[PDB]
Protein backbone atom coordinates (compact mmCIF):
# COMPACT_ATOMS: atom_id res chain seq x y z
CA UNK A 1 0.00 0.00 0.00
CA UNK A 2 3.25 1.98 -0.27
CA UNK A 3 2.99 2.65 3.45
CA UNK A 4 4.34 -0.55 5.11
CA UNK A 5 3.63 0.68 8.60
CA UNK A 6 5.44 -0.82 11.48
CA UNK A 7 5.15 -4.33 12.83
CA UNK A 8 7.48 -7.13 13.74
CA UNK A 9 6.06 -10.55 13.02
CA UNK A 10 7.95 -13.71 13.65
CA UNK A 11 6.42 -16.92 12.14
CA UNK A 12 9.64 -18.87 12.67
CA UNK A 13 9.90 -22.00 14.79
CA UNK A 14 13.48 -22.43 15.96
CA UNK A 15 14.71 -25.20 18.14
CA UNK A 16 11.80 -24.90 20.53
CA UNK A 17 13.61 -25.79 23.75
CA UNK A 18 16.74 -23.58 23.56
CA UNK A 19 18.04 -21.11 26.16
CA UNK A 20 17.45 -18.18 23.86
CA UNK A 21 13.83 -17.75 22.66
CA UNK A 22 13.46 -15.98 19.18
CA UNK A 23 12.56 -17.73 15.98
CA UNK A 24 14.20 -15.10 13.84
CA UNK A 25 13.70 -11.40 14.00
CA UNK A 26 11.73 -10.39 10.91
CA UNK A 27 11.47 -6.67 10.39
CA UNK A 28 9.87 -5.06 7.32
CA UNK A 29 9.47 -1.36 8.00
CA UNK A 30 9.02 1.97 6.22
CA UNK A 31 11.38 4.91 7.07
CA UNK A 32 9.44 7.14 9.43
CA UNK A 33 8.67 4.80 12.35
CA UNK A 34 10.02 2.06 14.64
CA UNK A 35 9.06 -1.43 15.86
CA UNK A 36 9.41 -3.48 19.07
CA UNK A 37 9.82 -7.09 20.21
CA UNK A 38 11.06 -9.02 23.21
CA UNK A 39 13.78 -11.63 23.63
CA UNK A 40 14.44 -13.94 26.58
CA UNK A 41 17.58 -15.75 27.84
CA UNK A 42 17.64 -18.65 30.41
CA UNK A 43 20.86 -20.41 31.65
CA UNK A 44 20.41 -23.99 32.85
CA UNK A 45 21.74 -25.37 36.15
CA UNK A 46 23.68 -28.29 34.61
CA UNK A 47 24.82 -26.71 31.34
CA UNK A 48 28.13 -28.68 30.47
CA UNK A 49 31.45 -26.86 30.42
CA UNK A 50 34.73 -26.97 28.46
CA UNK A 51 37.84 -25.51 30.15
CA UNK A 52 40.98 -24.69 28.22
CA UNK A 53 43.99 -24.07 30.37
CA UNK A 54 46.35 -21.54 28.92
CA UNK A 55 49.43 -20.94 31.02
CA UNK A 56 52.63 -18.98 30.77
CA UNK A 57 55.84 -20.92 31.45
CA UNK A 58 58.36 -18.20 32.34
CA UNK A 59 60.83 -18.48 35.27
CA UNK A 60 58.55 -16.31 37.36
CA UNK A 61 55.72 -18.88 36.96
CA UNK A 62 57.61 -21.59 38.86
CA UNK A 63 55.40 -21.20 41.91
CA UNK A 64 52.19 -21.92 39.94
CA UNK A 65 53.41 -24.13 37.06
CA UNK A 66 54.10 -26.90 39.60
CA UNK A 67 50.60 -26.66 41.06
CA UNK A 68 48.40 -26.56 37.93
CA UNK A 69 49.24 -30.24 37.48
CA UNK A 70 47.31 -31.10 40.67
CA UNK A 71 44.70 -28.33 40.31
CA UNK A 72 43.06 -30.04 37.38
CA UNK A 73 42.21 -33.08 39.55
CA UNK A 74 40.71 -31.28 42.50
CA UNK A 75 38.93 -29.08 40.02
CA UNK A 76 37.29 -31.85 38.00
CA UNK A 77 35.98 -33.09 41.29
CA UNK A 78 34.56 -29.66 42.27
CA UNK A 79 33.22 -29.03 38.74
CA UNK A 80 31.27 -32.30 39.01
CA UNK A 81 28.76 -30.46 41.21
CA UNK A 82 28.35 -27.63 38.73
CA UNK A 83 27.84 -29.12 35.29
CA UNK A 84 26.46 -32.08 33.28
CA UNK A 85 29.88 -32.77 31.83
CA UNK A 86 33.44 -31.51 31.87
CA UNK A 87 36.54 -31.49 29.65
CA UNK A 88 40.05 -30.10 30.08
CA UNK A 89 42.37 -28.85 27.33
CA UNK A 90 45.81 -27.26 27.49
CA UNK A 91 48.42 -24.99 25.96
CA UNK A 92 51.32 -22.74 26.75
CA UNK A 93 53.34 -19.74 25.70
CA UNK A 94 56.24 -17.43 26.50
CA UNK A 95 56.72 -14.47 24.10
CA UNK A 96 57.60 -13.65 20.49
CA UNK A 97 60.92 -15.15 19.45
CA UNK A 98 62.57 -12.37 17.46
CA UNK A 99 66.02 -10.65 17.61
CA UNK A 100 64.84 -7.52 19.59
CA UNK A 101 64.16 -9.83 22.57
CA UNK A 102 66.30 -12.95 22.19
CA UNK A 103 69.27 -14.00 20.15
CA UNK A 104 68.33 -15.68 16.91
CA UNK A 105 63.42 -24.02 28.17
CA UNK A 106 64.10 -22.30 24.81
CA UNK A 107 61.32 -19.68 24.46
CA UNK A 108 58.36 -20.06 22.18
CA UNK A 109 55.28 -18.15 21.06
CA UNK A 110 52.06 -20.02 21.47
CA UNK A 111 51.77 -23.76 21.24
CA UNK A 112 48.61 -25.80 21.57
CA UNK A 113 49.33 -28.95 23.52
CA UNK A 114 46.10 -30.76 24.33
CA UNK A 115 42.64 -30.64 22.81
CA UNK A 116 39.77 -30.63 25.27
CA UNK A 117 39.47 -34.09 26.77
CA UNK A 118 37.91 -36.36 29.33
CA UNK A 119 41.23 -37.94 30.23
CA UNK A 120 42.32 -36.12 33.35
CA UNK A 121 45.74 -37.79 33.37
CA UNK A 122 46.36 -36.62 29.82
CA UNK A 123 45.81 -33.13 31.18
CA UNK A 124 48.22 -33.87 33.99
CA UNK A 125 50.80 -35.14 31.49
CA UNK A 126 50.38 -32.06 29.25
CA UNK A 127 50.93 -29.75 32.22
CA UNK A 128 53.63 -31.80 33.96
CA UNK A 129 55.78 -31.78 30.82
CA UNK A 130 56.02 -27.99 30.53
CA UNK A 131 59.56 -27.02 31.47
CA UNK A 132 60.16 -23.57 32.86
CA UNK A 133 61.35 -20.88 30.37
CA UNK A 134 61.74 -17.10 30.37
CA UNK A 135 62.33 -13.95 28.37
CA UNK A 136 64.03 -10.58 28.82
CA UNK A 137 61.22 -8.03 28.93
CA UNK A 138 58.85 -8.38 31.85
CA UNK A 139 55.48 -8.58 29.88
CA UNK A 140 54.48 -11.86 28.19
CA UNK A 141 52.85 -13.20 24.94
CA UNK A 142 49.46 -13.99 26.57
CA UNK A 143 47.32 -11.92 24.22
CA UNK A 144 48.72 -13.70 21.17
CA UNK A 145 48.04 -16.99 22.89
CA UNK A 146 44.49 -15.93 23.83
CA UNK A 147 43.69 -15.05 20.31
CA UNK A 148 44.87 -18.37 19.00
CA UNK A 149 42.89 -20.14 21.72
CA UNK A 150 39.80 -18.19 20.59
CA UNK A 151 40.29 -18.80 16.85
CA UNK A 152 41.79 -22.28 16.47
CA UNK A 153 38.60 -24.20 17.15
CA UNK A 154 39.89 -27.05 14.98
CA UNK A 155 42.82 -27.56 17.37
CA UNK A 156 41.00 -27.12 20.70
CA UNK A 157 37.80 -29.01 19.92
CA UNK A 158 35.45 -26.68 21.82
CA UNK A 159 31.86 -27.94 21.94
CA UNK A 160 28.98 -25.72 20.94
CA UNK A 161 26.69 -27.23 23.58
CA UNK A 162 29.15 -26.60 26.46
CA UNK A 163 30.11 -23.26 27.94
CA UNK A 164 33.48 -22.42 26.46
CA UNK A 165 35.84 -21.15 29.14
CA UNK A 166 39.31 -19.82 28.51
CA UNK A 167 41.49 -19.86 31.57
CA UNK A 168 44.58 -17.72 31.49
CA UNK A 169 47.28 -18.02 34.15
CA UNK A 170 50.10 -15.46 34.41
CA UNK A 171 52.18 -13.70 37.04
CA UNK A 172 52.92 -10.71 34.82
CA UNK A 173 51.13 -8.43 32.39
CA UNK A 174 50.99 -8.93 28.63
CA UNK A 175 52.57 -7.14 25.67
CA UNK A 176 50.19 -4.92 23.78
CA UNK A 177 49.43 -4.13 20.12
CA UNK A 178 51.83 -1.53 18.62
CA UNK A 179 54.53 -2.45 21.19
CA UNK A 180 55.64 -4.64 18.31
CA UNK A 181 57.08 -1.74 16.39
CA UNK A 182 60.19 -2.39 18.58
CA UNK A 183 60.12 -5.96 17.36
CA UNK A 184 60.33 -4.81 13.75
CA UNK A 185 56.72 -5.90 13.35
CA UNK A 186 54.53 -3.35 11.66
CA UNK A 187 52.04 -5.63 10.01
CA UNK A 188 48.55 -6.01 11.60
CA UNK A 189 47.05 -9.09 13.18
CA UNK A 190 44.23 -10.33 10.95
CA UNK A 191 42.42 -12.12 13.77
CA UNK A 192 42.64 -15.60 12.18
CA UNK A 193 44.03 -19.04 13.21
CA UNK A 194 47.58 -19.71 12.21
CA UNK A 195 48.74 -22.92 13.83
CA UNK A 196 50.83 -25.48 12.01
CA UNK A 197 51.25 -28.75 13.87
CA UNK A 198 49.70 -26.82 16.80
CA UNK A 199 52.43 -24.10 16.65
CA UNK A 200 51.76 -20.37 16.10
CA UNK A 201 54.47 -20.02 13.46
CA UNK A 202 53.26 -16.53 12.52
CA UNK A 203 53.90 -15.16 16.03
CA UNK A 204 57.21 -13.74 14.85
CA UNK A 205 55.76 -11.79 11.94
CA UNK A 206 52.31 -10.65 13.14
CA UNK A 207 51.51 -7.72 15.46
CA UNK A 208 50.11 -8.56 18.93
CA UNK A 209 46.24 -8.37 18.80
CA UNK A 210 44.45 -5.32 20.17
CA UNK A 211 41.99 -5.52 23.07
CA UNK A 212 39.26 -4.64 20.56
CA UNK A 213 40.10 -7.66 18.44
CA UNK A 214 40.24 -10.03 21.42
CA UNK A 215 36.85 -8.82 22.57
CA UNK A 216 35.11 -9.25 19.27
CA UNK A 217 36.43 -12.71 18.67
CA UNK A 218 35.82 -14.01 22.19
CA UNK A 219 32.29 -12.77 22.17
CA UNK A 220 31.45 -13.95 18.67
CA UNK A 221 32.39 -17.57 19.36
CA UNK A 222 31.21 -17.44 22.97
CA UNK A 223 34.45 -18.05 24.77
CA UNK A 224 34.36 -16.45 28.19
CA UNK A 225 37.71 -15.65 29.71
CA UNK A 226 38.74 -16.09 33.30
CA UNK A 227 42.02 -14.47 34.05
CA UNK A 228 44.29 -15.01 37.03
CA UNK A 229 47.47 -13.27 38.18
CA UNK A 230 49.68 -12.40 41.15
CA UNK A 231 47.99 -9.62 43.20
CA UNK A 232 50.17 -6.64 42.17
CA UNK A 233 49.77 -6.97 38.42
CA UNK A 234 46.16 -7.90 39.06
CA UNK A 235 45.25 -4.27 39.44
CA UNK A 236 46.07 -3.64 35.78
CA UNK A 237 43.95 -6.56 34.77
CA UNK A 238 40.97 -5.75 36.97
CA UNK A 239 40.96 -2.26 35.49
CA UNK A 240 41.02 -3.71 31.96
CA UNK A 241 38.01 -5.96 32.55
CA UNK A 242 35.26 -3.29 31.78
CA UNK A 243 36.89 -2.84 28.37
CA UNK A 244 36.19 -6.38 27.10
CA UNK A 245 32.71 -7.83 28.03
CA UNK A 246 32.49 -11.53 28.90
CA UNK A 247 35.34 -11.64 31.41
CA UNK A 248 36.26 -12.30 35.03
CA UNK A 249 39.55 -11.98 36.85
CA UNK A 250 41.04 -12.50 40.26
CA UNK A 251 44.31 -12.79 42.04
CA UNK A 252 46.53 -15.74 42.62
CA UNK A 253 47.27 -16.24 46.30
CA UNK A 254 50.95 -16.41 47.35
CA UNK A 255 50.55 -20.12 48.16
CA UNK A 256 48.20 -20.53 45.18
CA UNK A 257 45.95 -22.50 47.54
CA UNK A 258 42.81 -21.66 45.68
CA UNK A 259 43.81 -22.17 42.05
CA UNK A 260 41.17 -24.92 41.79
CA UNK A 261 38.62 -22.44 43.05
CA UNK A 262 39.35 -19.47 40.82
CA UNK A 263 37.45 -20.90 37.92
CA UNK A 264 34.79 -22.25 40.22
CA UNK A 265 34.00 -18.87 41.66
CA UNK A 266 34.10 -17.39 38.17
CA UNK A 267 31.92 -20.19 36.83
CA UNK A 268 29.23 -19.33 39.32
CA UNK A 269 29.57 -15.64 38.42
CA UNK A 270 29.25 -16.46 34.71
CA UNK A 271 26.13 -18.54 35.26
CA UNK A 272 24.53 -15.62 37.07
CA UNK A 273 25.59 -13.01 34.45
CA UNK A 274 23.17 -12.71 31.57
CA UNK A 275 24.10 -10.07 29.07
CA UNK A 276 23.46 -9.55 25.39
CA UNK A 277 24.60 -7.23 22.70
CA UNK A 278 23.30 -5.70 19.50
CA UNK A 279 25.91 -6.07 16.76
CA UNK A 280 26.79 -5.72 13.01
CA UNK A 281 24.02 -3.31 12.22
CA UNK A 282 23.35 -2.33 8.62
CA UNK A 283 23.65 1.41 7.91
CA UNK A 284 19.92 2.18 7.42
CA UNK A 285 18.96 0.19 10.52
CA UNK A 286 19.11 1.54 14.03
CA UNK A 287 18.66 -0.51 17.21
CA UNK A 288 18.34 0.23 20.88
CA UNK A 289 18.05 -2.14 23.84
CA UNK A 290 17.26 -2.51 27.55
CA UNK A 291 17.12 -5.40 30.04
CA UNK A 292 14.44 -6.42 32.47
CA UNK A 293 15.62 -8.06 35.63
CA UNK A 294 13.40 -9.95 38.19
CA UNK A 295 14.02 -7.07 40.61
CA UNK A 296 11.84 -4.81 38.40
CA UNK A 297 14.60 -2.17 38.18
CA UNK A 298 15.05 -2.56 34.45
CA UNK A 299 18.02 -0.71 32.93
CA UNK A 300 19.30 0.68 29.53
CA UNK A 301 23.01 0.95 29.22
CA UNK A 302 23.97 -2.26 30.97
CA UNK A 303 24.00 -5.26 28.66
CA UNK A 304 21.90 -7.30 31.04
CA UNK A 305 21.31 -8.54 34.39
CA UNK A 306 23.26 -9.69 37.39
CA UNK A 307 22.33 -11.91 40.31
CA UNK A 308 20.22 -14.15 38.12
CA UNK A 309 19.91 -17.92 38.02
CA UNK A 310 18.06 -20.90 36.60
CA UNK A 311 14.26 -20.76 36.35
CA UNK A 312 14.63 -17.04 35.71
CA UNK A 313 14.17 -15.79 32.17
CA UNK A 314 15.99 -12.54 31.56
CA UNK A 315 13.86 -10.30 29.40
CA UNK A 316 15.28 -7.99 26.76
CA UNK A 317 13.44 -5.07 25.22
CA UNK A 318 14.53 -4.54 21.67
CA UNK A 319 13.54 -1.72 19.34
CA UNK A 320 14.47 -0.52 15.89
CA UNK A 321 13.86 2.41 13.56
CA UNK A 322 14.55 2.96 9.89
CA UNK A 323 16.47 5.44 7.81
CA UNK A 324 16.40 6.08 4.07
CA UNK A 325 17.38 3.14 1.86
CA UNK A 326 21.03 2.08 2.07
CA UNK A 327 22.66 -0.69 0.13
CA UNK A 328 19.32 -2.40 0.27
CA UNK A 329 17.54 -5.67 -0.37
CA UNK A 330 16.52 -8.23 2.22
CA UNK A 331 19.50 -8.90 4.49
CA UNK A 332 20.36 -11.83 6.75
CA UNK A 333 22.75 -11.26 9.68
CA UNK A 334 22.67 -11.87 13.43
CA UNK A 335 21.41 -8.99 15.53
CA UNK A 336 21.53 -9.96 19.20
CA UNK A 337 23.56 -12.45 21.04
CA UNK A 338 23.91 -13.44 24.72
CA UNK A 339 27.51 -13.64 25.68
CA UNK A 340 28.63 -17.18 26.46
CA UNK A 341 25.44 -18.71 25.03
CA UNK A 342 25.66 -20.48 21.67
CA UNK A 343 22.20 -19.54 20.44
CA UNK A 344 21.69 -16.10 18.86
CA UNK A 345 18.85 -13.85 17.70
CA UNK A 346 19.09 -13.91 13.92
CA UNK A 347 17.63 -11.02 11.91
CA UNK A 348 16.21 -10.40 8.48
CA UNK A 349 15.87 -6.74 7.64
CA UNK A 350 13.43 -5.60 4.98
CA UNK A 351 12.00 -2.34 3.62
CA UNK A 352 10.16 -0.85 0.63
CA UNK A 353 12.51 1.11 -1.67
Amino acid at each position, epitope marked *: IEYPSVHVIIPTENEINTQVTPGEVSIQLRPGAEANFMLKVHPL*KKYPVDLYYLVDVSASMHNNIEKLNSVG*N*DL*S*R*KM*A*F*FS*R*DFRLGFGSYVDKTVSPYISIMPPHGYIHVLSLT*E*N*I*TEFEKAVHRQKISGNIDTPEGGFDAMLQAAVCESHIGWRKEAKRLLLVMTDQTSHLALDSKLAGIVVPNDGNCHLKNNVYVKSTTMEHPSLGQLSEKLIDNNINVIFAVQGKQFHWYKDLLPLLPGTIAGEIESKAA*NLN*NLV*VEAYQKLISEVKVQVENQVQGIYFNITAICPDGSRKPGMEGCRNVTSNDEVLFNVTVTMKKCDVTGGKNYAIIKPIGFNETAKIHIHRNC
Partner: antibody
Amino acid sequence: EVQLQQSGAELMKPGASVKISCKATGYTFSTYWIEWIKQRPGHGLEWIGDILPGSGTTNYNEKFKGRATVTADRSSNTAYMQLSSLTSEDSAVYYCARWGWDSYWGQGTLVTVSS
Amino acid sequence: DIEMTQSPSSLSASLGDRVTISCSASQGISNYLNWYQQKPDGTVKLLIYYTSSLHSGVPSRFSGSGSGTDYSLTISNLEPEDIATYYCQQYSELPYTFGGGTKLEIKR
Protein backbone atom coordinates in the same frame (compact mmCIF):
# COMPACT_ATOMS: atom_id res chain seq x y z
CA GLU B 1 15.81 -45.14 33.85
CA VAL B 2 19.37 -44.46 34.94
CA GLN B 3 20.48 -47.05 37.50
CA LEU B 4 23.16 -48.33 39.84
CA GLN B 5 22.83 -52.08 40.52
CA GLN B 6 24.83 -53.26 43.51
CA SER B 7 25.97 -56.82 44.17
CA GLY B 8 24.55 -58.84 47.08
CA ALA B 9 25.59 -59.55 50.69
CA GLU B 10 28.09 -62.17 51.91
CA LEU B 11 29.50 -63.87 55.04
CA MET B 12 33.26 -64.19 55.71
CA LYS B 13 35.95 -64.97 58.30
CA PRO B 14 38.58 -62.48 59.57
CA GLY B 15 41.55 -62.16 57.24
CA ALA B 16 39.20 -62.45 54.26
CA SER B 17 38.96 -60.17 51.29
CA VAL B 18 36.01 -59.30 49.15
CA LYS B 19 35.55 -57.59 45.88
CA ILE B 20 32.17 -55.98 45.65
CA SER B 21 30.69 -54.10 42.77
CA CYS B 22 28.02 -51.82 41.49
CA LYS B 23 26.84 -51.85 37.87
CA ALA B 24 26.30 -48.68 35.92
CA THR B 25 23.60 -48.34 33.34
CA GLY B 26 21.67 -45.69 31.45
CA TYR B 27 24.57 -43.20 31.59
CA THR B 28 28.17 -42.96 30.54
CA PHE B 29 30.14 -44.89 33.15
CA SER B 30 33.40 -43.25 32.21
CA THR B 31 32.09 -39.69 32.77
CA TYR B 32 31.47 -39.56 36.52
CA TRP B 33 33.59 -39.81 39.56
CA ILE B 34 32.32 -42.85 41.40
CA GLU B 35 32.40 -42.66 45.15
CA TRP B 36 32.51 -45.35 47.70
CA ILE B 37 31.11 -44.73 51.15
CA LYS B 38 30.11 -46.99 54.00
CA GLN B 39 27.68 -47.02 56.91
CA ARG B 40 28.91 -48.40 60.18
CA PRO B 41 26.74 -50.11 62.87
CA GLY B 42 26.25 -47.10 65.12
CA HIS B 43 29.04 -44.84 63.90
CA GLY B 44 27.39 -42.93 61.06
CA LEU B 45 28.83 -42.73 57.55
CA GLU B 46 32.39 -42.78 56.35
CA TRP B 47 33.99 -42.09 53.02
CA ILE B 48 36.39 -44.83 51.97
CA GLY B 49 37.62 -43.88 48.51
CA ASP B 50 36.75 -43.23 44.89
CA ILE B 51 37.68 -43.64 41.23
CA LEU B 52 37.30 -41.90 37.98
CA PRO B 53 36.35 -44.87 35.66
CA GLY B 54 37.27 -42.78 32.64
CA SER B 55 40.82 -42.68 33.96
CA GLY B 56 43.51 -44.36 36.07
CA THR B 57 43.14 -42.19 39.17
CA THR B 58 41.78 -43.10 42.61
CA ASN B 59 41.50 -41.60 46.07
CA TYR B 60 41.59 -43.20 49.48
CA ASN B 61 40.63 -42.76 53.07
CA GLU B 62 44.01 -42.58 54.74
CA LYS B 63 42.87 -45.17 57.31
CA PHE B 64 42.68 -47.81 54.59
CA LYS B 65 45.40 -46.52 52.29
CA GLY B 66 47.54 -49.58 53.03
CA ARG B 67 44.55 -51.97 53.19
CA ALA B 68 41.90 -51.23 50.53
CA THR B 69 41.96 -50.34 46.82
CA VAL B 70 39.39 -49.03 44.29
CA THR B 71 39.03 -50.10 40.68
CA ALA B 72 36.93 -49.99 37.53
CA ASP B 73 36.54 -51.89 34.31
CA ARG B 74 35.31 -50.17 31.15
CA SER B 75 34.28 -53.52 29.65
CA SER B 76 31.71 -54.49 32.29
CA ASN B 77 31.12 -50.83 33.21
CA THR B 78 30.66 -51.50 36.87
CA ALA B 79 32.36 -49.92 39.84
CA TYR B 80 34.45 -52.04 42.17
CA MET B 81 35.53 -51.71 45.79
CA GLN B 82 38.40 -53.93 46.91
CA LEU B 83 38.54 -54.75 50.60
CA SER B 84 41.13 -57.07 52.20
CA SER B 85 42.60 -58.45 55.42
CA LEU B 86 39.25 -57.63 56.97
CA THR B 87 37.92 -57.74 60.48
CA SER B 88 34.60 -57.29 62.25
CA GLU B 89 34.82 -53.50 62.23
CA ASP B 90 35.20 -53.45 58.49
CA SER B 91 31.72 -54.83 58.20
CA ALA B 92 29.59 -51.99 56.91
CA VAL B 93 27.19 -51.37 54.11
CA TYR B 94 29.06 -50.04 51.14
CA TYR B 95 27.60 -47.78 48.43
CA CYS B 96 28.66 -46.74 44.89
CA ALA B 97 27.61 -43.36 43.29
CA ARG B 98 26.71 -41.08 40.31
CA TRP B 99 27.33 -37.42 39.24
CA GLY B 100 28.40 -34.94 41.83
CA TRP B 101 27.69 -37.43 44.64
CA ASP B 102 24.17 -37.69 43.21
CA SER B 103 21.17 -39.25 45.00
CA TYR B 104 21.76 -42.22 42.86
CA TRP B 105 23.88 -44.58 44.93
CA GLY B 106 24.16 -48.30 45.42
CA GLN B 107 21.70 -49.99 47.77
CA GLY B 108 24.12 -50.75 50.59
CA THR B 109 25.81 -54.08 50.67
CA LEU B 110 27.01 -55.71 53.79
CA VAL B 111 29.67 -58.30 54.17
CA THR B 112 29.83 -59.73 57.66
CA VAL B 113 33.23 -60.66 58.91
CA SER B 114 33.22 -62.77 62.04
CA SER B 115 34.37 -65.82 63.97
CA ASP C 1 42.88 -33.50 59.98
CA ILE C 2 39.73 -31.63 58.96
CA GLU C 3 36.68 -33.21 60.55
CA MET C 4 32.97 -32.43 60.63
CA THR C 5 31.02 -32.37 63.87
CA GLN C 6 27.26 -32.18 64.13
CA SER C 7 25.89 -30.23 67.06
CA PRO C 8 22.43 -31.89 67.44
CA SER C 9 22.12 -35.33 68.91
CA SER C 10 18.49 -36.43 68.84
CA LEU C 11 16.04 -33.76 67.78
CA SER C 12 12.34 -33.79 67.78
CA ALA C 13 9.38 -31.67 66.86
CA SER C 14 5.71 -32.07 66.04
CA LEU C 15 4.79 -32.60 62.45
CA GLY C 16 4.23 -29.28 60.70
CA ASP C 17 6.95 -27.62 62.84
CA ARG C 18 10.35 -26.29 61.76
CA VAL C 19 13.70 -27.67 62.69
CA THR C 20 17.27 -27.11 61.80
CA ILE C 21 20.27 -29.37 61.56
CA SER C 22 23.64 -27.75 62.07
CA CYS C 23 27.31 -28.58 62.05
CA SER C 24 30.85 -27.24 62.06
CA ALA C 25 34.39 -28.07 60.98
CA SER C 26 37.69 -28.37 62.86
CA GLN C 27 39.28 -26.36 60.02
CA GLY C 28 37.83 -23.84 57.61
CA ILE C 29 36.37 -24.87 54.26
CA SER C 30 36.83 -22.70 51.21
CA ASN C 31 33.94 -24.21 49.25
CA TYR C 32 31.20 -26.40 50.77
CA LEU C 33 28.98 -28.76 52.69
CA ASN C 34 26.51 -31.30 51.31
CA TRP C 35 23.37 -32.16 53.21
CA TYR C 36 22.27 -35.79 53.10
CA GLN C 37 19.28 -37.70 54.44
CA GLN C 38 18.38 -41.35 54.91
CA LYS C 39 15.58 -43.53 56.11
CA PRO C 40 16.26 -46.11 58.89
CA ASP C 41 16.26 -48.62 56.05
CA GLY C 42 16.84 -46.90 52.71
CA THR C 43 19.37 -45.33 50.35
CA VAL C 44 20.94 -42.04 51.36
CA LYS C 45 19.65 -39.09 49.34
CA LEU C 46 21.27 -35.72 48.60
CA LEU C 47 19.13 -32.83 49.66
CA ILE C 48 21.33 -29.80 49.25
CA TYR C 49 24.82 -29.18 47.90
CA TYR C 50 27.05 -26.11 47.86
CA THR C 51 25.02 -24.87 50.90
CA SER C 52 21.90 -23.93 48.95
CA SER C 53 21.68 -25.91 45.69
CA LEU C 54 18.48 -27.82 46.19
CA HIS C 55 18.52 -31.30 44.69
CA SER C 56 15.72 -32.02 42.25
CA GLY C 57 12.79 -33.96 43.74
CA VAL C 58 13.24 -32.41 47.19
CA PRO C 59 10.48 -30.07 48.54
CA SER C 60 11.25 -26.38 48.70
CA ARG C 61 10.83 -26.46 52.40
CA PHE C 62 14.42 -27.51 52.50
CA SER C 63 17.01 -24.76 52.59
CA GLY C 64 20.36 -23.83 54.02
CA SER C 65 23.42 -21.61 54.33
CA GLY C 66 26.71 -21.19 56.15
CA SER C 67 30.29 -20.01 56.47
CA GLY C 68 33.22 -22.31 55.73
CA THR C 69 33.13 -23.90 59.17
CA ASP C 70 29.53 -23.29 60.22
CA TYR C 71 26.53 -24.53 58.26
CA SER C 72 22.87 -25.31 58.63
CA LEU C 73 19.91 -27.09 57.05
CA THR C 74 16.41 -25.80 57.55
CA ILE C 75 13.29 -27.87 57.05
CA SER C 76 9.90 -26.17 57.44
CA ASN C 77 6.49 -27.87 57.71
CA LEU C 78 7.87 -31.26 58.75
CA GLU C 79 6.06 -34.32 57.43
CA PRO C 80 6.88 -38.11 57.90
CA GLU C 81 9.32 -38.03 54.95
CA ASP C 82 11.43 -35.48 56.83
CA ILE C 83 11.58 -37.49 60.00
CA ALA C 84 14.91 -39.09 59.10
CA THR C 85 18.64 -39.15 59.91
CA TYR C 86 20.66 -36.26 58.57
CA TYR C 87 24.32 -36.07 57.64
CA CYS C 88 26.91 -33.42 56.99
CA GLN C 89 29.47 -34.32 54.32
CA GLN C 90 32.23 -31.73 54.21
CA TYR C 91 34.14 -30.78 51.12
CA SER C 92 37.37 -28.83 51.32
CA GLU C 93 40.11 -31.06 50.08
CA LEU C 94 40.70 -34.77 49.94
CA PRO C 95 39.89 -36.93 52.07
CA TYR C 96 36.25 -36.11 52.29
CA THR C 97 34.38 -36.82 55.50
CA PHE C 98 30.98 -37.14 57.16
CA GLY C 99 29.71 -36.26 60.60
CA GLY C 100 28.19 -39.07 62.75
CA GLY C 101 24.56 -38.29 61.83
CA THR C 102 21.65 -36.67 63.69
CA LYS C 103 18.27 -38.34 63.97
CA LEU C 104 15.03 -36.39 63.78
CA GLU C 105 11.92 -37.68 65.62
CA ILE C 106 8.54 -36.34 66.69
CA LYS C 107 7.42 -35.79 70.26
CA ARG C 108 5.22 -38.10 72.32
